[PDB]
Amino acid sequence: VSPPPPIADEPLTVNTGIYLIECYSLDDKAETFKVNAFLSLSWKDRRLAFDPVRSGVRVKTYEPEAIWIPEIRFVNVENARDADVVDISVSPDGTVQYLERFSARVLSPLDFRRYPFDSQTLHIYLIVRSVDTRNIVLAVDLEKVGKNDDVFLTGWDIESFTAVVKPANFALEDRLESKLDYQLRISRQYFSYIPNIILPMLFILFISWTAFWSTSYEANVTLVVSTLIAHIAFNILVETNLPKTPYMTYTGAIIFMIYLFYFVAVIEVTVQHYLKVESQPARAASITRASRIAFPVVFLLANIILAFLFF
Amino acid sequence: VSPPPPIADEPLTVNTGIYLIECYSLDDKAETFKVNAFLSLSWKDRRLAFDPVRSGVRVKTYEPEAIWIPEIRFVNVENARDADVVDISVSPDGTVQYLERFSARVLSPLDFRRYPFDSQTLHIYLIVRSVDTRNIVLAVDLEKVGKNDDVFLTGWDIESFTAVVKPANFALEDRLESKLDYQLRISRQYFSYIPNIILPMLFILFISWTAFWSTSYEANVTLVVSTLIAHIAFNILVETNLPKTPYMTYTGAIIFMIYLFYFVAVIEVTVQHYLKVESQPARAASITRASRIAFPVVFLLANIILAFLFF
Amino acid sequence: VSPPPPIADEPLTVNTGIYLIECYSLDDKAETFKVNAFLSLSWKDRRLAFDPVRSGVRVKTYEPEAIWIPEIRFVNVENARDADVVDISVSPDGTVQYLERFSARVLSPLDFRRYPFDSQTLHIYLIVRSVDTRNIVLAVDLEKVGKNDDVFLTGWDIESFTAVVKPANFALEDRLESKLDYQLRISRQYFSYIPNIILPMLFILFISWTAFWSTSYEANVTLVVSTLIAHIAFNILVETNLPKTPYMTYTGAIIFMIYLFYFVAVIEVTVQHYLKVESQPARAASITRASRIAFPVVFLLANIILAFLFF
Amino acid sequence: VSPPPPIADEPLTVNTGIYLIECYSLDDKAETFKVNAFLSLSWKDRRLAFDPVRSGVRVKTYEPEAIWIPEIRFVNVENARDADVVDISVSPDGTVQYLERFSARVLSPLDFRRYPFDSQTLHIYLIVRSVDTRNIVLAVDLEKVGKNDDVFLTGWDIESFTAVVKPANFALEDRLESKLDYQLRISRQYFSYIPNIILPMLFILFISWTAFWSTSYEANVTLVVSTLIAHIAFNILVETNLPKTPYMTYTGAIIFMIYLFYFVAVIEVTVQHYLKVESQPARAASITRASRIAFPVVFLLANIILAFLFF
Amino acid sequence: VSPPPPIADEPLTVNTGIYLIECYSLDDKAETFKVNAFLSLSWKDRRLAFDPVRSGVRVKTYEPEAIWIPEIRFVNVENARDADVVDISVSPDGTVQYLERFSARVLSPLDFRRYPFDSQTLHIYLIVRSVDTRNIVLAVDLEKVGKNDDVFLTGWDIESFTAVVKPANFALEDRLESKLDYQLRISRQYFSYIPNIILPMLFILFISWTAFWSTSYEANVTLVVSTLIAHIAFNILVETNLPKTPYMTYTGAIIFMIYLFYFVAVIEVTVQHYLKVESQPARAASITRASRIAFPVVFLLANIILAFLFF
C-alpha cells in the first residue's frame, strides 16, 4: 500500500470529525481527562474509484489492511488509544469515508488561578506526518464534529466542543506536519466547595475572634490555637485536591491570608495578657476593643482586594 | 465478509440478551460499576443455510472471523470489553446463535440527594450502527435477559435487572443507530453509616451541649471547640467517600447545619462569660437556661424539616 | 473442530484439577484474592485414539488449536485469566491430559461478623456450558487437586484446599451447565490487632476513667474529650480496612459500645461539677465513687455479653 | 516442534543465568519487588547441528517459532512476564544460545522482626516441567548470572545476587520438575527512620514527663495526654508502611512498650493530684521525686532488654 | 532477515534521535517520569540500495517485517514500549530512515538533598546488543534530538534535553554493547511550598514563642504542645511526598532542627514554673527574658548554618 498520487501536486486534504460519546475522569492534579469518542476521516483516493453503472453497487466497503489509510495520531495522549474500526466506505469517485471508535486519557494543562470558580479549555490535538511522495493537510468537517446530549463530566459543566478549523502546519525533522485543535470548554461546579470548605473555614475563623470578648488568656490560647490547627487541616485537605502551581490560586490566597489573621490574633491575645499582668488592663482593654472592629473590617477589605485582583 | 442481504425491504433485527454473572466494584466518586456478564446475539443470515442430510450435523459451529457478525458496541464503558466468544451456532434456516462472555467498567451517573438512604438505576447501553447495504435494529429477547442468584454488589441491594424493550432508533452522522437500555436497580445498605458516622456525630454534638450546665468558660471553650474539630473530621471523612455534587445531599445538609449549632453554641458560651465578668450572672443564667431547651428543640425540628424536604 | 461424539447417550465427563502455586493479595474491602495455579483437564475423545504397537509412541502431544478442548470458564473472576497452555497429551484410548497455568483475581465474599477473629471459605468456581451435540458434566480428580507447601497468604493461615466433588448441574438459557466448587479455607492472623488497635484503644478508655479520681472539672473535660477524639481516630482507622457491611462486626460492636462509655463519662463529669457548684459535693462524691466501680464492672460484663453473642 | 531426543537416557540440562538490568518498586505491604533482567538459556539440540565448513557460517540465527525452546517459567510472579526475545544462536554441534529480556513483579516474603534495621533475601524461582518424551533438568551457568553496577533499589542496599546451583528436582501431578533459586540479598536504609520517626517520638515522650516537675494537674494532663496522642499518630504512621505480621517487630515492640509508660505516667499524675487534694502533698512529693529517676531508668533498661532480645 | 554485511571490518553505526512530544507524571517517591516521544534511527544497509535513474523514484518505503532493523532497546524503563512505527524510508545508496512513536515510564534516580529547591538530570538510555556477524555502535544525530515548545512537566521547569554524543561501549555476557545517554535537565517549582508548608510551619513556631511573654504555665503548655502537634502534621505531610533517602534533605534538616526548638521551649516553660513555685520568680524572669532574644537569634543563626551547608 502507497499514498494516493496527486492529480496535480496539491497535497491530500484529510477531513476530520470528532464526536464525543462519553466524557469522564478529569484529574486536576495530573491535568488529564478521559474521553470516549468517534473519529471520522475522509480523503480522495482515485485508485479506488469505480463506475456505479457497471459495478452495480453505489458504495464499496473495505477492511483497514486492504486500502491506504493516513496515519492520523493524537499528540497529547497518555494511553494507547483503544482504536476499533467501525466503517470504511468508498464512493464512485474514490472518496473514502472512515470511522473509528476510540478512547484516550488526554493531557491538557489547567489554570487554577480562579479555583474553584475556574473555567478550562481542554484540547484534543490531531496530527498527520506528510509522506515522501506527497504532503498531507488536515481539515475540519464541522458536520461530523460534536458531542452527545447525555455527555456529562462529573463536577463540571460542559459548555462547548469546537474545532480550530485552520490547521497549524509546521516543519518537524525535515517533514511537513498538519496539527488540528479540538477545544472542549468546561466550567467548574463550585457548589460543594461553599458548605464543605469555604463556610466551615469561615466559621472556625469567626470562632477564633471570640477571644476579643474574653479576658481569660488560658481560654484565648485554646480558642486561637485550636481553630488554627483546624485551619491547618483545611489548608492540607485543599492542597491535596490540587497540583503544585508556580502561581497563587484564589482559594490559596484566602487560605494563606487567614494564617496571618491567626498570627496577629495570637499577638493581640499575648499583648492583652502581658498588659493585664503589667497591672495596666486599661491599655489591654483599648487594644482588645479596637481588634473587635479592626479584624472583621481588615478581613472584609482584604477579601474585596483579593476578589478584585483575581476576577 | 458482508452483511446478510434483505429478501424484503426490512432491516436486520439483532436479538440481544444479557445475563449478569458477577456484579462488583461500584465507585461512588467515579459513578462507575464493574460487571461480568453473558451477551447473547441472534440474527438471520440466509447465506449460512445448510442441509443436515448432506452436512451430516443438525447445527453448525463457527469461528468469529469465519462469518459476518453485527458490530454491537457498549455506549457507557471505560475499559475495552474483555470479549471472549463462548459459542456461535447456525441452524439450517440460517439463524445465528451468538454468545460471548464480557466484563466492563460501566459509566452510569448516580443521584446522591438522599445519600446514604439513596437508590440508583444503573444503565448498560447496547448500540449498533447501520451499514451501507441495510439498516440494523436491536431487539430484546427477554428469555435470555437476567442475573444469577449469587450476584451480589457489596454494600448494595440488587432489586431488578430489566431491559427497555423498545430500542431508541435515531440518526447520527447520516446513519441509523439502534440503542438499547438495560437497567439495574439498586438500593444502598445504609446500616454501617448509623454506628460509624451518624450516631458518633450525634454523641459529639450532645457532648458539646453539656456546656449549658457548666459555668467554667475555660472548660466550655474546650468542650465546644474540641467536639467541633471532631465534627470537622467526620465532614472530611464523609466528603472523601462522595463526588463533588452541584446539589446538597441529605448527609451534607445535616453535617452543614450542625456547623451552625457549634457556631451558635460558641456565641452562647462567650455571652455567658462576658455577662459573668460584667457582674450580671443573672442574665447569663437565663440565657444558659434557655439554650438547654432551645438547642435540642431547634435541632429536633430542623432535622424534621430537612427529612421532610429530602424524602 | 467439533466435540467427541458419544458412544451412547451419556454426557462427556471432564476431570478437573486445580492446584495453587502462589496465593496472594487478599483485599477485605473488595472481597477479592489473587491466585497463581495449575488447571488440569481430562476427557475421552475417541477420534484421537491410536494403536500403541503400530504408532510406536505410547503418548502423542498436540497444540491447543489442533484438537477439540472443552470451554471451561471461571465464574467469580475479575480480570481475564492469564492462560498459558503447558501440556496436551493423548493416550492410546483417546484420553486427553490437558494442563494450563493460570492466574486470576477471584471474587469470593467475606463474613466479617467475628473480625479480626474471623475465618473465611474462599471459592473458585469452574463451569462448562454444554454444546448442541452433547452435554458436558464436570468431575473432580482429587489426585490433581492441592496446593504447594510454600503457598502463603500474608496475614492469614491457609487451612485447606478441597473440592465439592458433586458438581451443581443446572439449566441456563435453555442449556445444561455443570458448576464445580473449589474451597480454600483461611483463618485470620489477629496477633497484630491486639498491640496496634485493641490494647491502645483500651488504654485511652482507662485513661478516660481517671476523671473518677479527679475533682478538677477543667482537667476532666480535657481528659474525657481528648480520649474521645483518640477513639474517634481508631473507629476511623478500623472502618478504612473494612467494607460497609449490612451487619454489626465484633470490633464494630465493641468500638460503638465504647462511644456510650465516653458519653456517660461526660455526663458523670458534668454532674460532679454541677453538684460541686450547687454546694452539694456530698452527692457528687457518692456518684464519682459509684462510677469508680460501675464503669469497669459494666464494661467487663458488656464485653462478656458481646463475646458470648458473637462466638 | 518436539524436544531433542536423548543420545541415551540422560535428561536435557538447560543452562540458565539471570542478569538484573534494573531493580525497583519493593512493596513491604505486598511483599513484592519488580525486576528488569536478562534471562539466558542454553541446551543441546543435535537436530539443529551443522558442518561449519560447507555451511560457510560458524553460527546460525533462528526465530522462536522455528525451533524447539524449553518452557521455562517463573514460580513467584504476579503479572505475566514481559518476554522479548533478543537472540537465538545455534553453534555447529547444536548448542542453542537463547537470550530474552524480561520484567516481572516478584512475590518474595519479607521478615520484619528487626524492622527498620532488617535485612532480606529476595527470591526468583525458575522452573521447567519435564515432557512426555524426556525429563528436563535446570543448571546454573554462573558466567551469565549477575547484576549491573547502576542497579539500585530505592531505600535499600543491594548486597548480593547469587544462584543456588543445585536445582530442587521433585514430582508434581505425575511429572518431574526442576526448580532453581536466584537469591537477591538486600539490607534496609534505616537512616530516614531516625530523624523522622524514632527521634521525634522520643521527644513527645520526654515532653510527656516534664509533668514530673509540675504540680499543676491540668498541665500534666495536657503534657502526658497531649503528648500521648501525638504517639497515636506516630503509631498509625508506622503500621501503614507495614503488613499485618503474626509476630512482634522491633519498632512495634518499642512503640507498644511506650503505651505503657504513657499509661503509668497518667496513673502517677492522677496519684500526685489525689494525694495533693487529700492534704498529703508529702507522699505526692516522694512519688514524683522517684518517677523522675524511675521512668528514665526503667525506659533505658527496657530498651536494652528489647534490643538484646531482637538482635 | 540478517544484518547488513560490512564492506570492511567496520561496525554498523546506528544514528539515533529522540524528540520529546509530551513530558509528564514525574513521581518523586518512585523516581520515575513518563514520556511521549519520537525515536529516529538511521543505518547503511547496502543490500537495500537502488539506482534512482531506472527505479524512477528517489525513496522506497518498507514495512518493519520486510527489512532488517537493529534491536534498539531502553535500559531504564518500567512500561513496555508503546512502539508504533510511523515511517521507514530507503535512499538510493541504502540509508534507512526509521521513525517510531513511543511512550515509557522511565526510571531515573533523583537527588533530594536541596529539596524543594533541587534540580535534577533525568536520563533515557538507548542500548544495542551487537550480533554474531558484526558489532553495532550507536551515534547521535543532534538534528533529530530535541523537544516541542508546548512540552511541560507539571511543577517543574524544563531546562535542556541533550545527548551524550560519545556512546559508552562495553562488554556484557561475551558481547559488545553500545549505550547512549539522553539527559533531560529540570529544576523544581518551589513557589507553592512557601505559602503551603514553609511559612505556616514558621507561624506555628513563632506562635509557640509567645510563651516567653507569658507566666501562665497552664497556657504555655497549651501553646508549645499544640504548635508541636502542628509541626508533627507538617513533618508527616512532607515525608509522604518524598522517598526514604539515606541522607538528610534541606527541608528535612530544618523540620528536625525545629523539633529541638520545641523541646528546649518545653524545658524553658517547665523551668519558669518550677522556679515560680520554688518562690524564686527572680531567676524565672531572667531565664524567660534571655529566651526572648536567644530562641530567635539561635534559630536565625542555625538556619544560616544549614543553608550554608546545603547550598
Ligand code: NA
Ligand atoms: Na486544656
